[PDB]
Design an enzyme around this catalytic site. Structure first.
Site, PDB file in Angstrom:
ATOM      1  N   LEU A   1      58.778  87.536 -51.518  1.00 48.42           N
ATOM      2  CA  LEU A   1      59.286  87.435 -50.158  1.00 48.42           C
ATOM      3  C   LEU A   1      58.171  87.207 -49.152  1.00 48.42           C
ATOM      4  O   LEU A   1      58.408  86.709 -48.050  1.00 48.42           O
ATOM      5  CB  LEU A   1      60.054  88.702 -49.793  1.00 48.42           C
ATOM      6  CG  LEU A   1      61.534  88.640 -50.134  1.00 48.42           C
ATOM      7  CD1 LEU A   1      61.735  87.825 -51.389  1.00 48.42           C
ATOM      8  CD2 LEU A   1      62.070  90.040 -50.285  1.00 48.42           C
ATOM      9  N   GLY A   2      56.954  87.574 -49.534  1.00 47.03           N
ATOM     10  CA  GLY A   2      55.842  87.462 -48.613  1.00 47.03           C
ATOM     11  C   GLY A   2      54.542  87.906 -49.243  1.00 47.03           C
ATOM     12  O   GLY A   2      54.522  88.355 -50.387  1.00 47.03           O
ATOM     13  N   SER A   3      53.454  87.763 -48.494  1.00 46.37           N
ATOM     14  CA  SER A   3      52.157  88.274 -48.913  1.00 46.37           C
ATOM     15  C   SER A   3      51.189  88.259 -47.735  1.00 46.37           C
ATOM     16  O   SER A   3      50.829  87.194 -47.230  1.00 46.37           O
ATOM     17  CB  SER A   3      51.588  87.439 -50.073  1.00 46.37           C
ATOM     18  OG  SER A   3      51.297  86.115 -49.669  1.00 46.37           O
ATOM     19  N   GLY A   4      50.793  89.450 -47.292  1.00 44.58           N
ATOM     20  CA  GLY A   4      49.743  89.570 -46.295  1.00 44.58           C
ATOM     21  C   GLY A   4      48.396  89.637 -46.987  1.00 44.58           C
ATOM     22  O   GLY A   4      48.204  89.041 -48.053  1.00 44.58           O
TER      23      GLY A   4
ATOM     24  N   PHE B   1      47.027  92.843 -46.964  1.00 43.65           N
ATOM     25  CA  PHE B   1      47.156  94.242 -47.360  1.00 43.65           C
ATOM     26  C   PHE B   1      48.008  94.383 -48.618  1.00 43.65           C
ATOM     27  O   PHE B   1      48.088  95.461 -49.202  1.00 43.65           O
ATOM     28  CB  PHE B   1      47.785  95.055 -46.226  1.00 43.65           C
ATOM     29  CG  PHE B   1      47.026  94.971 -44.929  1.00 43.65           C
ATOM     30  CD1 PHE B   1      45.969  95.836 -44.670  1.00 43.65           C
ATOM     31  CD2 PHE B   1      47.368  94.023 -43.967  1.00 43.65           C
ATOM     32  CE1 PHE B   1      45.264  95.758 -43.482  1.00 43.65           C
ATOM     33  CE2 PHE B   1      46.666  93.937 -42.771  1.00 43.65           C
ATOM     34  CZ  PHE B   1      45.614  94.807 -42.530  1.00 43.65           C
ATOM     35  N   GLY B   2      48.645  93.286 -49.023  1.00 38.00           N
ATOM     36  CA  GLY B   2      49.477  93.292 -50.214  1.00 38.00           C
ATOM     37  C   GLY B   2      50.633  92.311 -50.122  1.00 38.00           C
ATOM     38  O   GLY B   2      50.880  91.731 -49.068  1.00 38.00           O
TER      39      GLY B   2
ATOM     40  N   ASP C   1      49.664 100.197 -38.359  1.00 42.33           N
ATOM     41  CA  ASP C   1      49.918  98.763 -38.411  1.00 42.33           C
ATOM     42  C   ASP C   1      51.249  98.350 -37.774  1.00 42.33           C
ATOM     43  O   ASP C   1      52.138  97.810 -38.434  1.00 42.33           O
ATOM     44  CB  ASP C   1      49.842  98.245 -39.853  1.00 42.33           C
ATOM     45  CG  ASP C   1      49.655  96.724 -39.915  1.00 42.33           C
ATOM     46  OD1 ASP C   1      49.460  96.096 -38.839  1.00 42.33           O
ATOM     47  OD2 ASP C   1      49.702  96.152 -41.031  1.00 42.33           O
TER      48      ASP C   1
ATOM     49  N   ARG D   1      55.406  91.306 -37.167  1.00 44.82           N
ATOM     50  CA  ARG D   1      55.616  90.896 -38.545  1.00 44.82           C
ATOM     51  C   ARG D   1      55.990  92.117 -39.381  1.00 44.82           C
ATOM     52  O   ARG D   1      56.428  91.985 -40.526  1.00 44.82           O
ATOM     53  CB  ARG D   1      54.347  90.229 -39.101  1.00 44.82           C
ATOM     54  CG  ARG D   1      53.350  91.186 -39.727  1.00 44.82           C
ATOM     55  CD  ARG D   1      51.894  90.836 -39.410  1.00 44.82           C
ATOM     56  NE  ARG D   1      51.044  92.020 -39.588  1.00 44.82           N
ATOM     57  CZ  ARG D   1      49.901  92.244 -38.942  1.00 44.82           C
ATOM     58  NH1 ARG D   1      49.435  91.361 -38.062  1.00 44.82           N
ATOM     59  NH2 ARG D   1      49.236  93.371 -39.164  1.00 44.82           N
ATOM     60  N   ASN D   2      55.815  93.304 -38.803  1.00 45.67           N
ATOM     61  CA  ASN D   2      56.178  94.553 -39.474  1.00 45.67           C
ATOM     62  C   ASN D   2      57.393  95.184 -38.833  1.00 45.67           C
ATOM     63  O   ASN D   2      57.598  96.393 -38.938  1.00 45.67           O
ATOM     64  CB  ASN D   2      55.039  95.567 -39.417  1.00 45.67           C
ATOM     65  CG  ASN D   2      53.862  95.157 -40.246  1.00 45.67           C
ATOM     66  OD1 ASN D   2      53.991  94.384 -41.194  1.00 45.67           O
ATOM     67  ND2 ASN D   2      52.697  95.670 -39.897  1.00 45.67           N
TER      68      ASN D   2
ATOM     69  N   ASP E   1      56.668 100.195 -42.881  1.00 45.19           N
ATOM     70  CA  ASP E   1      55.297 100.534 -43.222  1.00 45.19           C
ATOM     71  C   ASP E   1      54.872  99.902 -44.546  1.00 45.19           C
ATOM     72  O   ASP E   1      55.650  99.845 -45.496  1.00 45.19           O
ATOM     73  CB  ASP E   1      55.157 102.058 -43.301  1.00 45.19           C
ATOM     74  CG  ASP E   1      53.926 102.500 -44.090  1.00 45.19           C
ATOM     75  OD1 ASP E   1      52.784 102.251 -43.621  1.00 45.19           O
ATOM     76  OD2 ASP E   1      54.116 103.100 -45.177  1.00 45.19           O
TER      77      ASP E   1
END
Length: 287
Positions: A18-21, A23-24, A137, A141-142, A155
């Site tokens: 679904l995604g990837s920053g 931080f993970g 954070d 986007r969060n 989180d």
């Protein structure tokens, strides 16, 4: 109250990304209990870098709180895999994050929505404050969209729980989101609830600008010194002096001179009950 379930990381099947920053990465996954044949759709946030038993402990500490949230505006943690790499298990959120949302419904987002999202994010944050959590954070986007009238704060493991005496959390080195951090955070790696307010302020700017990048162009190397001058994110077009002058209060050097999250729930609510007075958006009634 204690609800956190610690799960075998071999009970989860990762399916799509679904995604990837940095931080993970976040997977669309599938929890398959052990000794059972049912398969339940979860979302799996997995942290990239392995973690010291201090990092593990602080996460574990923060996670027992996240697994017990009452608030409608915070994502409750469903479970966690600790083992080697840490994986936060959490409810699927199909509408996406709020950042990506405003960027492709810019032409249909009116003032009532913007202002209501601000009230909700603040409510969510104030809750975490009452629970002694420093979110560390906060960004657009969060923030996740449950429904377009209902956003929730999420989180990725970087939140920290303040001891019963503590007021600050001093952090080790690592990768950081510079363009959302207070100053104390960029210089001293110190985090307060009041720094979360700084971040809240940027998040809101992000929304009023409909998903703009903070300090676009400027390299993270400079931010620290640009702030020290007194330069801040510019006033959004749709913004009135009244809304911007709140954002600005969030980026005050003296963190004791920022608004508290409860003071912020109050101003943004009185605004959310007369939206056309506070945001000047084109074709606003037509949405």
């Amino acid at each position: 109250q204690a609800l956190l379930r610690i799960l075998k990381e071999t009970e989860f099947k990762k399916i799509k990304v679904l995604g990837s920053g940095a931080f993970g990465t976040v997977y669309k996954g599938l929890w398959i209990p052990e000794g059972e044949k049912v398969k339940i759709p979860v979302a799996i946030k997995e942290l990239r870098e392995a973690t010291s038993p201090k990092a593990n402990k602080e996460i574990l500490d923060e996670a027992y709180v996240m697994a017990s949230v009452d608030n409608p505006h915070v994502c409750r943690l469903l479970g966690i895999c600790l083992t080697s790499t840490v994986q936060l298990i959490t409810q699927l959120m199909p509408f996406g994050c709020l950042l990506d949302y405003v960027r492709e419904h810019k032409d249909n987002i009116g003032s009532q929505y913007l202002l209501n999202w601000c009230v909700q994010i603040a409510k969510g944050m104030n809750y975490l404050e009452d629970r002694r959590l420093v979110h560390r954070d906060l960004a657009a986007r969060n923030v996740l969209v449950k429904t377009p009238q209902h956003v929730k704060i999420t989180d990725f493991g970087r939140a920290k729980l303040l001891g019963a005496e503590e007021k600050e959390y001093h952090a080790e080195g690592g990768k950081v989101p510079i363009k959302w951090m207070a100053l104390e955070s960029i210089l001293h790696r110190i985090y307060t609830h009041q720094s979360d307010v700084w971040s809240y302020g940027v998040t809101v700017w992000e929304l009023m600008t409909f998903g703009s990048k903070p300090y676009d162009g400027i390299p993270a190397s400079e931010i620290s010194s640009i702030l020290e001058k007194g330069e801040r994110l510019p006033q959004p077009p749709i913004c009135t002096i009244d809304v911007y002058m709140i954002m600005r209060k969030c980026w005050m050097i003296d963190a004791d001179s920022r608004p508290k999250f409860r003071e912020l729930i109050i101003e943004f609510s009185k605004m959310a009950r007369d939206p056309q007075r506070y945001l000047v958006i084109q074709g606003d009634e037509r949405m």
